[PDB]
Amino acid sequence: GCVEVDSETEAVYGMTFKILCISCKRRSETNAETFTEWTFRQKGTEEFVKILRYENEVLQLEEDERFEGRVVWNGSRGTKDLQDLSIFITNVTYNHSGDYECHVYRLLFFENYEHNTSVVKKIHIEVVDKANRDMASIVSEIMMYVLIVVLTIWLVAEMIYCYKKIAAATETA
Amino acid sequence: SMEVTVPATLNVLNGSDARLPCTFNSCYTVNHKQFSLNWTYQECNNCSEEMFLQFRMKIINLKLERFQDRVEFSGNPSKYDVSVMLRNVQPEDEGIYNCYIMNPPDRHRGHGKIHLQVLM
Amino acid sequence: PLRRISIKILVHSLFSMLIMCTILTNCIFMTMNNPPDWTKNVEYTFTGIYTFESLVKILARGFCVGEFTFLRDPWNWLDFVVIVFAYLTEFVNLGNVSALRTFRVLRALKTISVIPGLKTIVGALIQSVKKLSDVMILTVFCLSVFALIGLQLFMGNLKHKCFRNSLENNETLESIMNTLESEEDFRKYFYYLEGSKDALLCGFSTDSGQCPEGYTCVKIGRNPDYGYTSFDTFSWAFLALFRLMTQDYWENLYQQTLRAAGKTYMIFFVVVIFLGSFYLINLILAVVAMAYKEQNQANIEEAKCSPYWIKFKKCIYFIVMDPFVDLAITICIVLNTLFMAMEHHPMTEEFKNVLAIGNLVFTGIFAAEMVLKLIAMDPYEYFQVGWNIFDSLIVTLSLVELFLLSVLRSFRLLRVFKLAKSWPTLNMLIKIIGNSVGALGNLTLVLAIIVFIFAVVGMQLFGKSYKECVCKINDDCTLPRWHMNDFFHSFLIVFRVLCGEWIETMWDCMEVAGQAMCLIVYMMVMVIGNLVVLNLFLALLLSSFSGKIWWNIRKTCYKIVEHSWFESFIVLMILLSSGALAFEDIYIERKKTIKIILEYADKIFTYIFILEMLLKWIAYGYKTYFTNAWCWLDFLIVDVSLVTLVANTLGYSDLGPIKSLRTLRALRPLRALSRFEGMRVVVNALIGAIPSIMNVLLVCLIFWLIFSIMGVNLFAGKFYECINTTDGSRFPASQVPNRSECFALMNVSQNVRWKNLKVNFDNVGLGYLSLLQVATFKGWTIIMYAAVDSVNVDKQPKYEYSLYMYIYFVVFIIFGSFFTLNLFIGVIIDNFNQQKKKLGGQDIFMTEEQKKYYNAMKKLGSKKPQKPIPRPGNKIQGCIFDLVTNQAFDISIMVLICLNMVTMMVEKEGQSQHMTEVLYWINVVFIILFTGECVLKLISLRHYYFTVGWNIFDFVVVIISIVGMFLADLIETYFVSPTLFRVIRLARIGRILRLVKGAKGIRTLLFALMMSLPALFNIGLLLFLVMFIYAIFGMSNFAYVKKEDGINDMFNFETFGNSMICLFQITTSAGWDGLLAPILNSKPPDCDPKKVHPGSSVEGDCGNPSVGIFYFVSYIIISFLVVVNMYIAVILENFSVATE
C-alpha cells in the first residue's frame, strides 16, 4: 500500500523534475477528504508565497511568473482523498530553487466524529547544471571492484602455494 | 415468554392492607426506558379493564376515583418484582387485577391475573 | 417356588432382549424436546418395565436377605438410582424440573449394561485413564506456569480501545463510561472496526498500534468476546491458555494480544505453542498409546428346455474369463468415473445431453454383464460372493432410476472401489473401515452412545435458555446457526467439539446459560469425548498395523574445495546472500542508499558462486559432479541468477520472463540445506518416505474424488446469492427470489450483487479445494452454511432449506478426515520404523556429533548413590546439618513453595493499594525464608552442597529473586519504562520451578522432553529454512493484495517481519483459509486491476488465483509432513524413558 518516500533534492537545469510529498493516513480503512497547499520561497529570500492549491479535482495555480506555466499535478487522481500529493515541473529553471513547504488538510469522517488535521511536508531543492552521480553509487562501485579483485588475488595466491606443494609430492615418491 | 408468578386467588379481610404479589421473570437485565409495567382492575370477569398504575420511566399512579389514594406501588422491578399494595381494602375492591409486563428486548408480554376477594 | 420362577425369569434369552428393546425405544423419546401430552402415558410404561425388570433381579438375588446378591455389583447401583428417580418425581420433587429431568438420561447408560460385551469396553477405557495420572499433573502445572507468565506480562492489555480526543460539553472519560451502555451509544464514542462486535484493540508501542488520527488510546471497559477473552485474572488466564494448548481458535488470541501488546511479544506465543501445545498433546498420545499396547497385548498373550440351459450355462462359465473379460470391465469402471467427473455450474445444452447418453451406455453395460454373469454360474452360485451382492445393489439402483431422491442416482460412483482387490494400499483402507464396525465394533458403539447422551443432556439443560435468551447471543433476535435447541442441532454442537472447536460455541452458551453450567458440560464433553475418540483412533491404528600438467592442477583444486576455510567461507556467503533477500519489500523505496548497496552486493555474490562452481568442476569432474543430487540443486540456482545477470546487464529486461525469473530468487536460501549437517539428516529421512507417502496419497485422491463428485452433483451452481454490498447481508427471498429477479433490482438499485462463494463445488477441481477446508476444519463452516441454505441452481437460497445436507459433511469428516488421517499417520510412522531398522537401529534424526551428546544425557538417568557427606565435627554445625538432612524438613519447604505459588494467583487487574501492599510484603517474607534455607544448607553441607545439581538451581533462583526485587525497586526510584519492570518480575516464577524437584512422576516426563531436544532442534532448523523461503516468495508475490479477511495492517505480507508472523500462524494451519481468500479474488468488481499505490511503481492489487492456491496448499502440506516428524521424535524418546 502507501509508503512515505522523501523527494529528490537535486534538479538538473533545463529538464523536468518531480517533487514528491506523500502523506499516509494511520489507518487505510478510514475515509477522508483532502486538499493541499504548496508554498515556495526562493533561495536568498525570506518567506513563502503560496504557489498552488488543489481541492476537489481541479488544480489552482498562482499567477506568479516564477512558476507560471511549467507545473502539472502528479497527485492521486479522482480519489478525492489524495494521500499522495506531488508536483511535476516541466522545463526546470534556476528560478525554481529554494525551500518548498507543502501542507495537507484532511477531513476524516468517523461515526459521529469529524476530524480536521494538518501535517506539513517541506521539500528543499537546489538546481544544478549537470546531474551529479550520488556518492553512494560511486563508493559502492569502486568498493565492489576491490572485493572482486582482492578475492581473485587471494584465490590465485593459494594455488601458486598449494600447487607447488602438490607438484613436489609426486617427485619425492 | 415472560414468567409471571401471582396468586390466582387472594383473600383479604375488609380494612386490612392487601399486597398483590406477582413475579415476572425473563432473561437479560431490566432497562428503565425499556421496562414497562401496567396494572388494571375489573369489577368482574367480563367487565372493562381500568388501568390504575403504570411504569413508564417511573411509576405513574393514575389515582382512579374508585381507589381513592389507597393504591401504592410495592415492588422493585429490577428484582423482577412489580407488586402493588391496596391499603385499607374495601368491599368494592373485590374483582380481577391484571399485571402486564413488556420488557425490551424481550418481545413477549407477561400477564398475571389475581382474583381479589374481600372477607367480612 | 416363587424364587425359582423369578430366578427362572431372570436368566432367559428373551428377557435380556426384552429389557434392551424397551431401552432403545426410550431413547427415541428423549429426543422429543416438547413431547405431546399423550406421550406422558408412554413415559409411565417405561417406568413400569424398569421396575419389573428391576424388581425380579432384587427379589431373586436378595432372598429377603438384604438384597446382598443384588447390590453387590456396581452397575446395579445405577438401576436403583433410576427407579427411585422416576418414582421420586411423582413424589414431592425439587424445583428445577430440567435439572432434575436430565437424570432420566441415565437410562441410556443402562444400555451399556444390557448389550453384551459393552461392560468390558467401558472398563477397558477406565484403565487407560489411570495411566494418565502423571501427564495430568504435568499438564496442570505447565498450564499453570504459563498462566502466571501470561498474567504478569499481559494483564489489562486486552482493555485498550481508541477513545476519541475531543468531547463536547466538558465530558470526561470517567463521566462518559458510567452513563452509557448500548452498542449504538458505545460506537459513537470508541472506534469499532466497521461492524465488529467489539471496539478495535489499540497499542502504546510503535510496533503494535494503531488508532486513526483524532482518536487516542486509553484502557477502559470489558475485554473482547463478551469479556470472556482476557488475561486479567488467574482463572481467566487459565482458560485463555487452555484454549491455546488445544489450539482452538488460537489464532485470534494470538492476533489480539499482539495488536494490543505489540509484535515483539510474538515470542511468548512461539514458546507456548511450540512447547505447551505441540509437546503436551504429544505426551498424552504417547501415554494413551503406550498404555493401550500393554493391555491389548497382555490380554492377547493369555489366549496364545432344461437340456438347453446346461449347454448354454456351461458356456457362460467359460465366459468368466478372469484373465481378460473380468479385467476388461475394471478399465470400464475407471473410465466411467472419469466420465462422471465432468460437470460445472454452467454447461451448454449439447454437452449436458451427451453426459446423459454416455451414462446410459455405462449403466447398460454394467447390467448386461450382471444379467450375463447370472446365466453362467446360476443364481445361487452368483450370490455366494460378497462383492457380487455389492455389485448387484448398485446395478439395480440404476435400472429403477429410469422409471420410478435423485441423489441416490449419483451413488453409482462407489463402484470405483472394485479396484481395491488389485491394489495393496486400497485393500488396507478397506480393512481399516471394516475394523471399526468389525472387531472394534463394540468400542465404536460406545462412541456412538456417548455422543448421544451428551447431545440429549445438552438439549435438556440449555434448550429452553437458547430460545428465551436469543438476544444476548444474537443481534437479530433469532436463533444462531449453532445452537442447542433441537436434538439434531444439539447433536451438531457435540460433534463439533470432538474436532477442537469448543470455544466459539461456548461463549454463546455462557451468555444464555451462565458460566458455571456451560463450563462444566463443555469441559466434560471435551475430556471424556476426546478420550474415547483418541482410544478408537489409536486402537484402530495399532490393530490394523499388526606432460599431463593438467593432473597436478586437478589435484590442487581438489585440495582447495576440501579445505575448511573454503568450506567455511562458502557457508558465510550463503547466510549473507540469503539475508540480503529480507530487505526488499514495500519499504525499499525509502532508504534508497541500502537499495543501491544491495543491488551491487548481489553481483559480488553471483561472481563468487559462479567461481566456486568452476572449482567444483575441476576438482570433481563432470561425471562425479552431475551424479550428485545436491550439485544439481546448486548448479541450477547459479544458473537462474546467472541468466538474470546477463540479461540485466544487456538491458532488454522486464519483459515477463526474464522478469518472472527474478521472483525465482527466493530459492537462494535453498543451497543452505546441503551445508548444515543437521538439516541434511532430516531431509534424508523425508526422501526415504516420499515413495511410501505417494501410495497413501493416491488412495486419498481416489477416495476424496468420490466425495468430490458426489458433492458436485448436490451443490454445483447453488451457492450464488444476492447480497447487499454495503454489509454483505443476503436478501430475504421474500423479494428477489431468483437470479432473474435479482438483476432487476440492480437496474433500479446501486449496490446489490449476485455473487458466488469463491471456494465451492462448481467443478470437480474446486470441490477438491472445498473438501480440503472441511478436512482441516478451517473455513469449513462458511461452506456448510451455504450447503444447507441452498435450494436450486438459479434460485436465491432460503435459510436452512436443506438442513439435512449437514449429514453429508458429517459423513465426509468421519471417512475423509478421521479414516484417511488414520491411514496417513499409520503409514508414515511405520515407514519411519523401517528406516530406523535399516541404519543399524540408530535414531535417524541426529547428526553423528549429536549422537555422542545424546548418550551423555542418557547417563543422567542412573540413580547410583552419591556420597552422603559427613556432619562437621562441631555440634552447632552438626545439629543444623542434622536438621537440614532430615526429610521432614524438606517436605516443609515443598509446602512453603506451594504456599508461595498460591500468592501469585491472587493477583488480579485493578486490585487496589491495600491489596497490593500486602502481596508485596508477603512476597518479601518468602524471599527471606527461601534465602534462609539456602544459607542453612550451606552452613552444614559446605563444599558438599555444591555437588548436587538441584542445589545449584536452587541457589541460582535465590540470587535471581533478590536481584529482581531490588532492580524493580531501583527501577521505581529511577522510573521511566514500565515494560522493563514486568519482565524483571518474571524472575519470581523461578521459585515455582523448584516444585519439579519434589515430584518423581513429573520429572520422568520432563527428562523425556530434554532427551528429544537434539532431534527437535534439527527439525526446527529445517522448518525455519522452509518458512524463510516461503516468506520471501510471499513478500514479492502477495504484498499489494487488497486487504480483506486475515490480511489487514499487521499480519500482512508487506514486510519480512510481517510475513514471518503470518507463516508461523499458518504452520498449525490456523486461519490458512482466511489469508488465501484475498489472494483468490481477481478482476472487477472483486478488485481493481490497476491501482495507484502511492510511493511505488507497481499497479493493481489482484491475487493470482493459480499461484496463490499452489503456495498456500503446498505450505499446508509441507508443514504437516514435518509436524508428523515431530510426533515421531517425541514418541520414540517417550517410550525409551518410560521403558527404563
Ligand SMILES: *[C@@H]1O[C@H](CO)[C@@H](O[C@@H]2O[C@H](CO)[C@@H](O)[C@H](O)[C@H]2NC(C)=O)[C@H](O)[C@H]1NC(C)=O
Ligand atoms: C443495503 O444496505 C444499506 C446499508 O444499511 C441500506 O442503506 C440504508 O438505507 C436506508 C434507507 O434507504 C437509510 O436510511 C440508511 O441510512 C442506509 N444506511 C446507510 C448507513 O447508508 C440500503 O437500503 C440497502 N440497499 C437496498 C437497495 O435496500
Ligand SMILES: *[C@@H]1O[C@H](CO)[C@@H](O[C@@H]2O[C@H](CO)[C@@H](O)[C@H](O)[C@H]2NC(C)=O)[C@H](O)[C@H]1NC(C)=O
Ligand atoms: C423468477 O421470479 C420471478 C418473480 O416472481 C417470476 O416472474 C414473475 O414475477 C412477477 C412479479 O413481477 C409475477 O407477476 C409473475 O407471476 C411471475 N411469473 C409468473 C409466470 O407468475 C419468475 O416466474 C421466476 N422464474 C423465472 C423467471 O425463471
Ligand SMILES: NC(=O)OC[C@@H]1N=C(N)N2CCC(O)(O)[C@@]23N=C(N)N[C@@H]13
Ligand atoms: N469460519 C470457519 O471456518 O470456522 C472454523 C473456525 N472459526 C473461525 N471463526 N475461524 C476464523 C478463521 C478460520 O480459519 O476460519 C477459523 N479460525 C480457526 N482456528 N478455525 C476457523
Ligand SMILES: *[C@@H]1O[C@H](CO)[C@@H](O)[C@H](O)[C@H]1NC(C)=O
Ligand atoms: C527568473 O528570475 C528573474 C529574476 O529573479 C526574472 O526576471 C525572470 O522573469 C525569471 N524567469 C522567468 C521565466 O520568469
Ligand SMILES: *[C@@H]1O[C@H](CO)[C@@H](O)[C@H](O)[C@H]1NC(C)=O
Ligand atoms: C506526472 O505528469 C506527467 C506530465 O506529462 C505525466 O506524463 C505523468 O504520467 C504524471 N505522473 C504519473 C501519474 O505517471
Ligand SMILES: *[C@@H]1O[C@H](CO)[C@@H](O)[C@H](O)[C@H]1NC(C)=O
Ligand atoms: C524550455 O524553455 C525554452 C525557453 O527558454 C523552450 O524553448 C524549450 O522548448 C523548453 N523545453 C522543452 C523541453 O520544451
Ligand SMILES: *[C@@H]1O[C@H](CO)[C@@H](O)[C@H](O)[C@H]1NC(C)=O
Ligand atoms: C477544517 O474545516 C473547516 C471547514 O469548516 C475549514 O475552514 C478549516 O480550514 C479546516 N481546518 C484546517 C486546519 O484546514
Ligand SMILES: *[C@@H]1O[C@H](CO)[C@@H](O)[C@H](O)[C@H]1NC(C)=O
Ligand atoms: C397499558 O395497559 C393496557 C391495558 O389496557 C395495555 O393494553 C397496554 O399494553 C399497556 N401499555 C404498555 C406500554 O404496555
Ligand SMILES: *[C@@H]1O[C@H](CO)[C@@H](O)[C@H](O)[C@H]1NC(C)=O
Ligand atoms: C465544565 O462543566 C461545567 C459544568 O459545571 C461547565 O459550566 C463548564 O463550562 C465546563 N468547562 C468547559 C471548559 O466547558
Ligand SMILES: *[C@@H]1O[C@H](CO)[C@@H](O)[C@H](O)[C@H]1NC(C)=O
Ligand atoms: C434500468 O432499467 C431501465 C428501465 O427504465 C433501462 O432502460 C436500463 O437500460 C436499465 N439499466 C441497465 C444498466 O440495463
